[PDB]
Amino acid sequence: APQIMNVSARQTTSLDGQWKTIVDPFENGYYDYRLKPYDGGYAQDKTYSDKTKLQEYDFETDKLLFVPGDWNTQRPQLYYYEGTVWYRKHFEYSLQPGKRLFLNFGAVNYEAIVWLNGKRLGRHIGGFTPFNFEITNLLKEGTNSLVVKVDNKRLPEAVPTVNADWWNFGGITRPVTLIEMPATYIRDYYVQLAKDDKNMIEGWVQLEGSDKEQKITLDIPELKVKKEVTTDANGYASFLIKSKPILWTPENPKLYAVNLASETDKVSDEIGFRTIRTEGIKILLNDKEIFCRGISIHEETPYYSGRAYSKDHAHTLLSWAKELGCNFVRLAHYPHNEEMVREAERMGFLVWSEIPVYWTIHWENKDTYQNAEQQLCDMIARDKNRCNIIIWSIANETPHSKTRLTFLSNLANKARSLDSVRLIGAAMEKEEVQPGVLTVNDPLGELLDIISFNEYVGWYDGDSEKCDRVNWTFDTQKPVFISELGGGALYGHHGSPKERFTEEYQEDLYIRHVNMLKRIPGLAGTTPWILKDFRSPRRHVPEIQDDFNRKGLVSDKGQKKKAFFVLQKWYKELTEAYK
Amino acid sequence: APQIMNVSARQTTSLDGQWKTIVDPFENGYYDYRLKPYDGGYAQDKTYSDKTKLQEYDFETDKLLFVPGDWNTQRPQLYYYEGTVWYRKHFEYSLQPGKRLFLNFGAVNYEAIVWLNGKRLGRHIGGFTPFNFEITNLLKEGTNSLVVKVDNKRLPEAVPTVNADWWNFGGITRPVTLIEMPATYIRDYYVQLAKDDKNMIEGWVQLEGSDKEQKITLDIPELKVKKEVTTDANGYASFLIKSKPILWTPENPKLYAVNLASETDKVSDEIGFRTIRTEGIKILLNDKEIFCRGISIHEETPYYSGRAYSKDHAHTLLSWAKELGCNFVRLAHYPHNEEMVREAERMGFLVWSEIPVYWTIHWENKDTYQNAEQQLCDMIARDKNRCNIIIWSIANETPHSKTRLTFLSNLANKARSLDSVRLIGAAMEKEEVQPGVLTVNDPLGELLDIISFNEYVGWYDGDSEKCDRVNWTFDTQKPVFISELGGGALYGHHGSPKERFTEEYQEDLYIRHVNMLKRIPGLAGTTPWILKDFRSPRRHVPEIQDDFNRKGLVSDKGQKKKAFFVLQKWYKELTEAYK
Amino acid sequence: APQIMNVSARQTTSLDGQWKTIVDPFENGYYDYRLKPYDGGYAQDKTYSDKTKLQEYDFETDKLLFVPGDWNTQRPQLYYYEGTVWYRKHFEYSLQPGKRLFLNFGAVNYEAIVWLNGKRLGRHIGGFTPFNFEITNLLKEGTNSLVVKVDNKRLPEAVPTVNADWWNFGGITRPVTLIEMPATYIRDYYVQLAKDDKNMIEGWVQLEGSDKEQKITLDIPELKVKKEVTTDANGYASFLIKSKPILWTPENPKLYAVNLASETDKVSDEIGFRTIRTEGIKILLNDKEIFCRGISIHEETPYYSGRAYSKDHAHTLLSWAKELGCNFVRLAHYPHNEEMVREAERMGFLVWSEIPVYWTIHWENKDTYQNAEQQLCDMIARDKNRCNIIIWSIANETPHSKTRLTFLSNLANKARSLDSVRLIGAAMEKEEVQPGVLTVNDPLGELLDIISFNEYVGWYDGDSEKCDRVNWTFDTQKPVFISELGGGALYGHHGSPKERFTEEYQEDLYIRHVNMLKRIPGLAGTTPWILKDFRSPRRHVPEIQDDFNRKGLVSDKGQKKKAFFVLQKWYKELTEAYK
């Protein structure tokens, strides 16, 4: 039930493919007509072969869905579906006694309830973070039954809440994986550079199980590093190691093979090393001033616009970012699958990672807060060894209020106590200093290392020309990072640059908007909205949006719009400028 | 806004056909990202003709839906849809000044918000009762814009609530009508026999408008009747008319042409006359003891299984009930469309009419009660001149509790305060006196004219054999009425009479269940469940249910299953024994 | 109307995006009720703006389809659809006086008929080869109307004919492009090594237009080559160039920038250089013995399984082939899009390219032969400069008749007269020498450089064990190339190695099939069937096939089956052996 670091390097067996499914809008499979739980609900996975008895379902003769994936793009009937779908899987597994077996979900949106062989394993909320169950003692010989009740109903108190600008993709959206472990295993570990110290590798390791005190060995063959330690009685041990590793950067994404070994377990990883700091309005990677030439990206696939989960999906999206000239990607509005981060790390993209605290969250709900902080904790726990990640962001656009402020401040501080290296960000509130002159105004900026905010001058705030008459001033000399900007266009739809939603309008906007960005003092990062057209239920212009937010520089069908090349040209100037 | 009696008889213009529509699952057209209402939402019906300005919708180029109709059967994507769909109609209408104009919706499930020319007319909850707006002063020349925002999300506090065994059919489910009235018009009237008096016609008439005191004439020509009264300062007048009409019966459903005429309006009707009362365990219609040879019916069409609304739909269903031997039909679980009631009155079926107070209603919620009572009032107000209805039911199966009893007693009193003639029913709690012997035990019965209850012996309570070892007894000596019973079968699926869901099992069930009914002391009525298979989201056996409740005696495709003829044979004998 | 070389390098304007469409199954848009052509059919693209007159259509208010792409996966209703769909596009283009403008279709399946502003430009048959029209003198000012009548009806006499094992993907399956040319332009050109000579570049260039005698330069800067020549009265010139270019291989796919300029035009290109020949049972690339570690690939996308067309599609597919350990890809069963071939060229994959001459072609129909030979000519003319293509194939599996022999012989002779460098292959008739001993017996073999054939021992011919019971011998000392082999499995479906369609069966099948391949004297190449599960209308096992051929080593969802790694291991050993 605790997070497992680097699942892909473990002893894994996939459960993916196609599973039997039951769409259950009124949750008949969970509650009876009194609205109470009942034995004999669908969790029992009872093949309906004796027809002298009465039951109301039969996984064995029902329809399939693919796992992993959203359900919305797999059947017309499921496009808008919000509610419960039951997934069932049968599998066999041979586990020698003493060995341990875990069931890992990369992600399930939004609530998952899980049973093995008719016995409840647990419950998860939050649709974008992994979770594990140990099934060591519940495995049976022969056929095992795995049942997952998945529900994506919008909940006022959820994270996110009843309103948002992206599709409500339900289902088992990321791979489902079995993991075999020795009785005491390497559960967690941290291997990064010490804060601001390019000559000190530091980290720790965490065993799990009963034989908690063991000789650990950390190997980095290419750095001639062989460090030994012994975990204390809590299965914990820390270390410092002197080394001068080649530093990861976007232009040389240097990664090192790291091998961890205990007396009873072992695991390998790819880990690069860098430092990241603020100095006034400057952002410093390995002590050099950099500009973050970024782009924002939803976890949505090329061509057919389902939930992304694979390396193929990551590679195609990033290869567009590459052509766009980015050295940075913002992954909105939630933690993406581990393959996106790994592929960004491999190709040399810095990363902004993020939780879906977004619009009208319930700031007074003690449960809502626990939810969001759990997501924050899990986002950082999974990716803490990914050096291309330099910004953690604890909030998107939010209405201002004292409850909001106290909520986000708790997240910001918690982020800082988990990762004293990377930069903490959040979407800050904007204020008019005097006409034609804008600034930021958020008392949460004291817990942030950057001045991050969204603005849509020229699309939602005025026509394009208004980018020509807006300017920005700041009362603090922290690096300024604009996390969203842009506007919509349908690829192939042409006309006057005054005609909104044409490629021509969007091109004119990006020209003028870039000129406005060139005037902003302290500007050190931008990630326009967005790389690719994506699904939203808030976009209803027929033949133009068709349930798609059209602010992509690339169409959902991979076609580069005219505005793609405006941003591309600017990023070329910027690359030479900071070279 | 007040109800209008006998809408079909007024000066009517149909707004039916195909309307433009927008599916809006997050309610973008009503709320903004702050979750606040905003001017400029879709109610403004603003055609998106000037693309220099930004807008997120356009009715003019969007998709159509049939009106009337559920949306669920019209598009695969809407099959499961729960949430907001916007409808938009354009129309012209010439109103001679002084004349008034009303907008009548037969039904909209579940919440309707209505606008004319960008102005809100009001809001309605309750998906099976009609409602009106006066649009006399809002009509413009040329094109008028009617926008209706329909939402069918299940609400915990709603009536019905978040669980129920029928499809959540959203949309504008019954015809939409323009009614023109004189400045002062006959709004409402009542013309029926006096309680247990086959020689006294009583009634009243109610005007609406300024000319409140008028001479009123009531003409029943075939009876050689003409009473001429005059209305008070409220527009109200009552009357008593000694007459010896031919009384309506199922075998001879006599109806009279009735003509009302004030100084400034007239309106005709077809009304019949009959007496109805209980005498001990007997039900007496026109002083003669009858048995209600009945069958239950959902408001759902033959063959394609959409929401029924037309005279054609009613006729097909009723001619199945005719062939079954019925003299009675129970319309579940809500007020059906008027066409259905009228068709039943004309062919000769007594009717049971009811409201969707069903399972876990929020008994302690005062708005919930107000909703249910409003639905009660609207039900009785519309049909009070329909002589063929003899039972109003205020409740279906509900849990046992004090709040439920208080709630249901208030409805039962209200029903009685609204109609002194018809019988009041409700699904009562049952109890097992001794093994094999059951009874009713429910203090609500004290407020009811019958012992009415649902029982599914042989389907939910045991296999078919258990019907042979269950018997009933009753303390109170009222007529006993079983409003639901039966079990499921797929037409064309055959096997052993032991195999559930074959035709042979359902036949065996009905044969044993009928012998059980024949041992029930005081049995006066049976409306078995059900006439035609119907859509339910709680029926998930593949290839057998497929989201259909299969307890019809007739398939959803009009095929008579074997059990149909069992019940038909008993109903033939009941016709003999009660002649 | 003639072919144009290197379309992507010219001055191009995409017409892609979404077009208006009319599904027209009875070709009402083209015939009247007399089955005769008629004026005012849909080719006239006449907006229905005057409802005083009668017409049966209106593109302006009809539905969209994405272009490029198959229609089948864009709507449920079009999945199986065979027939006509009208595509309509409006566009503007500013063509300076004297310049020429061409409409280029990458491909349309099967029959395309094309109109600009109501005038027929012409017709094309054959679904996988590009075609052009000149619209220089038809372009009008302002709004131009492009109408394409697309029909994919299966025709007995067509190429392919009424039966084949892949989906009938209809539509404008590949990009549509406007190409602007000077009044006299470089239409075609050839630049490659001379046969077997590592030290000699040969080639030619062809002009189109009235200024036919011009000075042409060919520059290859990295080779310090600058050749000037002058064209003759036919616009033709040939050349020879002593040079020692770095030779292209899969391991080092070196490409040279090549620049061509005449007096009025210029075009650049990327072209590699290699020699290829057979020597006995040996295939020699740049005089080195190679094994073709191949995989077959249909032109179908990962994940959603539409018609592939983009570099994104090719890269993902080819990336799987790279992980498999391939140095070679067979593109079946027709010419793929040019993106696929360029990406194989750039990444390092030798290529097999072929035409859809397949199963029961009408060998005696002269129009059928002309069609097949046109497809051959278009295939070779487009890719003659792609050094990575080393094999052209003029036929897949065919029946064993004299007319077939004549038909294919003429194809094989035409291919050789078009290209004397590349190898010519075709799937050859097999025969049983004696029990357990197969061979090839096909007189066509005289005209082919390799002994190429398909065999599915262990899937269609026996169980997996029969691979152990089969051996091969050949009378002729030519390299043996098996173009297809394998069997089906559903990813995630697990069982005994004896149960067909499990991953275990396919894995066992591949172990014993590879061992059979190890015993084949002369084996110089294999391209197993197939890389990725693909759609097929002859694959009907529910839950297993569901209209997919399951013989992929990769699921249609990117998942590597167990058998993938069997082939991967053998290719790893073949790599070391042929080092």
Ligand SMILES: O=C(O)[C@H]1O[C@@H](Sc2ccccc2)[C@H](O)[C@@H](O)[C@@H]1O
């Ligand atoms: O509408 C959009 O395109 C985007 O709006 C922003 S919110 C915002 C709007 C105006 C100014 C400042 C912030 C969301 O972050 C994004 O998910 C959504 O897609």
Ligand SMILES: O=C(O)[C@H]1O[C@@H](Sc2ccccc2)[C@H](O)[C@@H](O)[C@@H]1O
């Ligand atoms: O499940 C059914 O077939 C029906 O069950 C009854 S409730 C009940 C169940 C068992 C015993 C007593 C009452 C509902 O009135 C009905 O709408 C539904 O269709």
Ligand SMILES: O=C(O)[C@H]1O[C@@H](Sc2ccccc2)[C@H](O)[C@@H](O)[C@@H]1O
């Ligand atoms: O059935 C298959 O999987 C494949 O069959 C071959 S034909 C063949 C079958 C048996 C022996 C020799 C040749 C086709 O080339 C291919 O398109 C198709 O998919």
Ligand SMILES: [Cl-]
């Ligand atoms: Cl947009």
Ligand SMILES: [Cl-]
């Ligand atoms: Cl049922």
Ligand SMILES: [Cl-]
């Ligand atoms: Cl297959």
